[PDB]
Short mmCIF file of C-alpha atoms and ligand atoms in Angstrom, two decimals:
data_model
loop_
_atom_site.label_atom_id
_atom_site.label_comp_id
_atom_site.label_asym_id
_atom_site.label_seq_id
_atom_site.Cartn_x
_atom_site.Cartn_y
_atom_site.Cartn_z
CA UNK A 1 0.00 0.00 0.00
CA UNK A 2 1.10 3.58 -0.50
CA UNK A 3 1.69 6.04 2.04
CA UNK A 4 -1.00 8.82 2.82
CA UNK A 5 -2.00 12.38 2.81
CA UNK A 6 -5.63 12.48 4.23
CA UNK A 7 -7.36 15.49 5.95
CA UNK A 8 -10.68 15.67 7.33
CA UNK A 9 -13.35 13.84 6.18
CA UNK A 10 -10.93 12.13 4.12
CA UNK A 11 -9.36 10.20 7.04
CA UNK A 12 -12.39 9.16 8.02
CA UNK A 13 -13.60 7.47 4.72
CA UNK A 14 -9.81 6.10 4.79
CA UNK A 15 -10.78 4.43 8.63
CA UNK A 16 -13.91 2.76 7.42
CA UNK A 17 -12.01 1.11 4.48
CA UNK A 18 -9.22 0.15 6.56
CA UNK A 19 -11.81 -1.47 9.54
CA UNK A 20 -14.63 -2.15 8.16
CA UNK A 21 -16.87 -3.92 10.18
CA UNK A 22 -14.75 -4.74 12.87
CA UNK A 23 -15.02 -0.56 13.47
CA UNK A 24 -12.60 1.99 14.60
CA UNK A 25 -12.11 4.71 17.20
CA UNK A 26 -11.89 8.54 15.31
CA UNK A 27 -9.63 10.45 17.43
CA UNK A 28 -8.09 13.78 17.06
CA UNK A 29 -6.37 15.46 19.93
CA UNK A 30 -5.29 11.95 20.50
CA UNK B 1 -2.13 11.85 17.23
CA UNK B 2 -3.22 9.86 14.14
CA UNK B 3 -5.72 12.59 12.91
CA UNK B 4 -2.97 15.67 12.72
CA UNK B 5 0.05 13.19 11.66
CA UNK B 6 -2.20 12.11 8.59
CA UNK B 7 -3.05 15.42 7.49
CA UNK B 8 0.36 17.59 8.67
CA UNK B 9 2.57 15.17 7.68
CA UNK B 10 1.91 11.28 6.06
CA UNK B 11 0.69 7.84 7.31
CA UNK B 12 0.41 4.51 6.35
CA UNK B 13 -2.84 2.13 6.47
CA UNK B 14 -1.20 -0.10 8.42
CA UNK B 15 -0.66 2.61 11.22
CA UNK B 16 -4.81 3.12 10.19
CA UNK B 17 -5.32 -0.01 11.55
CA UNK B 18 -4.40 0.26 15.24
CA UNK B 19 -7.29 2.54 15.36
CA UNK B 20 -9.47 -0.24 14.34
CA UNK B 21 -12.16 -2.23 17.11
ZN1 ZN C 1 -11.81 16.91 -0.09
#
């Protein structure tokens, strides 16, 4: 896979794809 | 965190993926 440049909503589309239905935790200040 | 290094700098899926359930 290739590295990434993702801001805003795009990170979260990019989460979803990468978890699917096991889910994932969006978390910025983290 | 994983939010600001994705979008100030780069990040691979596979670091994606420890944010995963
Ligand atoms: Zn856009």
């Amino acid at each position: 896979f290739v590295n990434q440049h993702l801001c805003g909503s795009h990170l979260v589309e990019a989460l979803y794809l990468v978890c699917g239905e096991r889910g994932f935790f969006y978390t910025p200040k983290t | 965190x994983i939010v600001e290094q994705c979008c100030a700098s780069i990040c691979s899926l596979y670091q994606l993926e420890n944010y995963c359930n």
